[model samples]
Target: MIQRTPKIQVYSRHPAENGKSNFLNCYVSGFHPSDIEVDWLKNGERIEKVEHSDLSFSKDFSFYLLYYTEFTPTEKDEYACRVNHVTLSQPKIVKF
Candidate 1:
């Protein structure tokens, strides 16, 4: 089987407003084998109870998946997404 590295993207679904509830997205694509790990982080701490999209496929046999959760963005808050796969030397991290 061929190996493909994952590409990670972190973004908010809407324009971020401090103290307003918004959904943060961690869109991971192009990875191979479909065995992976995903995490949501808030200010360097692990966050639980987030939502996940079912693993999807691409034309090239790579895989795609998404993690999202409601958050209240603020100047003092920091968020990030972390992904791990066989293709990566280390966990991939994306911040928003």
Candidate 2:
């Protein structure tokens, strides 16, 4: 039974790369279907990169997935995180 859609979220984080690495974290949860396609767009393109991370479960019992990617400062590179689920018309896009 793979029908639940993911509740997607977007954010940024620095993962101790000499205090230099800045990555966009796309958190998708609150969905029954864990096999979600977390698409991370570099500079707003069809570019699908990064792997799923921050995976876990809750007492309520539902599947979830997370993706994180890197991007430049606000000076350049406007990134986006897209999510694809079964219970949607198309891939949901969010700018970050």
Candidate 3:
């Protein structure tokens, strides 16, 4: 958490217990107010979501946008999550 600023977390691909599937996810939270934006990026290209996860409340009043795509992963691409909020001027970025 960065004060009124937002924070992002990226969970790269991980083998699930079933031993055959990967759930790659990401999230943003610890921000003030409600208007915020989050997106997942690979190699600087934005991976658009038809609709990302819904905003939900934290222990406080801030909300969250998490649980990104369950997509395939690669060995070389640099995956990351980006965010924008009134609290932050420049977009906040958190890499996996």
Root-mean-square deviation of candidate 2: 2.6
**Cα misplacement distance, residue 5 of candidate 1 (Å):** 0.4
- Model 1 per-residue lDDT at 27: 90
Q: Across residues 1-96, which tens digit of lDDT does each residue of candidate 3 receive? A: 434666677785555675566556777766787777777777888876544485787777777767576667788977787888887778877777
Measured with C-alpha atoms, the lDDT of residue 67 in candidate 1 is 78
Which sections of candidate 1 miss by over 4 Å? 15-21
Ranking by TM-score: 1, 2, 3
Residue-wise C-alpha lDDT for candidate 1, range 9-95, written one tens digit per residue? 899875457445577888998888889999888899988855757688978898989778777788889899989899888888888
The reply for model 2, stretches above 4 Å from the true place, is: 1-3, 48-52, 74-76
Best by TM-score: 1
Selected candidate, larger TM-score, 1 vs 3:
1
Q: Which candidate model has the greater lDDT, 2 or 3?
A: 2
Candidate 2 per-residue lDDT, tens place, 47-83, comes to 7555648788775668767777665657577777888
How much is 59 displaced in model 3, in angstroms? 5.4
